[PDB]
Design a protein around this nucleic acid. Structure first.
Ligand SMILES: [Mn+2]
Ligand code: NA
Ligand code: NA
Length: 327
DNA sequence: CATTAGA
DNA sequence: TCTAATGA
């Protein structure tokens, strides 16, 4: 956590670089288990060999470990950090919709800067166009203060359309959080569950309304179950317009709401821990259900959930307010 | 780890 | 169809 800190960080730097700048999924996977492992190790790594003994740590890494322990640096790390090319990829990748793949290609073509990206909007597909358009707004944290006004808005229309729609804004926002990166609204309806062959309109109506009033301004991707767009709160009585925010809305079979909800509520650790817990308690939990465990090694049979509670109850725990799902 | 876009 | 990018 702090004892093998640089070690893993240097490790993680390395990996990432292979994966993105290079297209070396192996080396990249190398740097990772190694970083994974040295990280679990209970003692101050004193040298390559010491590390070396580790599963996954080879002569390659161990070698880097020395130079890094010997001098507070690494050449490769220094050279890479310098490398205009790899820098460039590191950056373009920031655009919503630009993966490494396209970052390399763009670069190859010679698009390195944002401005480059601009003179060639054409080479860009819609997602990246929008991604480019709101590049500034996408990088900004969402003040909870607005989260409240946005949630306010969603809920309302949602209800306005059908009164049967149930919506929840998940994420850190739900868990207290002072700010968040984007909003996640999970959604379901009663007319839609595991069997009952869809109702694409379900999602559509809603999105339609949102847009109708101008809360949603763009569409990144809209499918029959997952809409991914852009919203913005009414820029009041001028002098102050609001930043463009990312929003995600997803239809959910009423029969798996809470699990989903439980899940996307996090935290990443609370979950795991919760998850690790159902296990002893004779269960199993995943994003959509909670099945009682059987001795044969495994077992099925999706227990019925009406609220976040049932899940708790099942696993027999103290209902934990979102606020304290912190870990 | 599954859901959309695109080509 | 596969392959990328998001989320998470
Ligand atoms: Mn989010
Ligand atoms: Na080894
Ligand atoms: Na990106």
């Amino acid at each position: 956590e702090t004892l093998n800190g640089g070690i893993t960080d240097m490790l993680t730097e390395l990996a990432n670089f292979e994966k993105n700048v290079s297209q070396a999924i192996h080396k990249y996977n190398a740097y990772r288990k190694a970083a994974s492992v040295i990280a679990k190790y209970p003692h101050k790594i004193k040298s390559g060999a010491e590390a070396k003994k580790l599963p996954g740590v080879g002569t390659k890494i161990a070698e880097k470990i020395d130079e890094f322990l010997a001098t507070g640096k690494l050449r490769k790390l220094e050279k890479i950090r310098q490398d205009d090319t790899s820098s460039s990829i590191n950056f373009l990748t920031r655009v919503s919709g630009i993966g490494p793949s396209a970052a390399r290609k763009f670069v190859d073509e010679g698009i390195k800067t944002l401005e480059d990206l601009r003179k060639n909007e054409d080479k860009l597909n819609h997602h990246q166009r929008i991604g480019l358009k709101y590049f500034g707004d996408f990088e900004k944290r969402i003040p909870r203060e607005e989260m409240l006004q946005m949630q306010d808005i969603v809920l309302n229309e949602v209800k306005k359309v059908d009164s049967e729609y149930i919506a929840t804004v998940c994420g850190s926002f739900r868990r207290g959080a002072e700010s968040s990166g984007d909003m996640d609204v999970l959604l379901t309806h009663p007319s839609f569950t595991s069997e009952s062959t869809k109702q694409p309109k379900l999602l559509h109506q809603v999105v339609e309304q949102l847009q109708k009033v101008h809360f949603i301004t763009d569409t990144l991707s809209k499918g029959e179950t997952k809409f991914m767009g852009v919203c913005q709160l009414p820029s009041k009585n001028d002098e102050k317009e609001y930043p463009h925010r990312r929003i995600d809305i997803r239809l959910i079979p009423k029969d798996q709401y809470y699990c989903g909800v439980l899940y996307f509520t996090g935290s990443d650790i609370f979950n795991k821990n919760m998850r690790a817990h159902a296990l002893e308690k004779g269960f199993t939990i995943n994003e959509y259900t909670i099945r009682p465990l059987g001795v044969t090694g495994v077992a099925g049979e999706p227990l019925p959930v009406d609220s976040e509670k049932d899940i708790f109850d099942y696993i027999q725990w103290k209902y934990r307010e979102p606020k304290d799902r912190s870990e």
